[PDB]
Structure 1
């Protein structure tokens, strides 16, 4: 089955664009990454950076995750991100999202050897 690291990449990485290019970014990406296939995922963030720059966060500033786990890390630098969250009209299978551009630090949980992101915790 898909590894947690691979699921993080599929759900949260978009190295192919530097920012969201239109209000339809989230609608299209949530669909394309299969985040709407079984239900409308309510919120999701995409990170417009290289994979290595995001994986490097696992050696940056340790901080406890929202859920209390101690394997979370905050990036030293801000990153280009897109916040996706459902619009009021979103209704499966016609999932619909508001796209919001931002430049924020990210917080990720890390596991494994290599020690890499497995969960996107927050933009801050």
Structure 2
């Protein structure tokens, strides 16, 4: 069974590229990480930093989560990320995405022992 920590890694980690992420990136990545299986997931962010660096965000700047919970943390440094957002003409099962690379602070929710990222909240 997939732990919440594992699901965060599958959905949100891509340390293998620094972000040279082509226009193709989101179409390929959303599919291979199984985010287009039951529907087209509308919005999803991939972080291009080490797992150690992203996990360390759980000990960084504590900020309110969008849902009002208090277990969110914003990175002190900007990180290389790619936002994937569904196009208007995207129709399941042919999920289509706009790929946008940026350098931004990430906000993640953390839980558990060890205290690790389990949700991607936002980038700022």
Q: Check whether TM > 0.5.
A: yes
What is the CA deviation profile of residues 11-49 of structure 1, one whole-angstrom value per residue up to 9, with x for unaligned ones? 000010001421010000000000001100000000000
Distance in 1 (alpha carbons) for counterparts of 2:49 and 2:2: 22
TM (norm. structure 1) is 0.98
| Runs of 4+ displaced beyond 3 Å | none
How do 1:1-124 residues align onto structure 2 when only pairs under 5 Å count? Answer: 1-124=1-124
**1:41-80 per-position Cα deviation (integer Å, ceiling 9, x unaligned):** 0000000000000000000000010000100000000000
Deviation readout 1:62-114 (Å, 9 max, x if unpaired): 00100001000000000000000000111000000000010000000000111
Q: Given that residues 21 and 101 in structure 2 are in contact (C-alpha distance below 8 angstroms), is that contact kept between their aligned partners in structure 1?
A: no
2:121, 2:23 → 1: CA distance? 24
Contact 2:58/2:73, CA 8 A, preserved across alignment:
yes
CA distance in 1, matches of 2:21, 2:108: 25
Moved more, 19-28 or 65-74: 19-28
Deviates more, 1:40-49 or 1:18-27: 18-27
- C-alpha distance in structure 1 between counterparts of 2:42 and 2:65, whole Å: 19
Number of aligned residue pairs: give it: 124
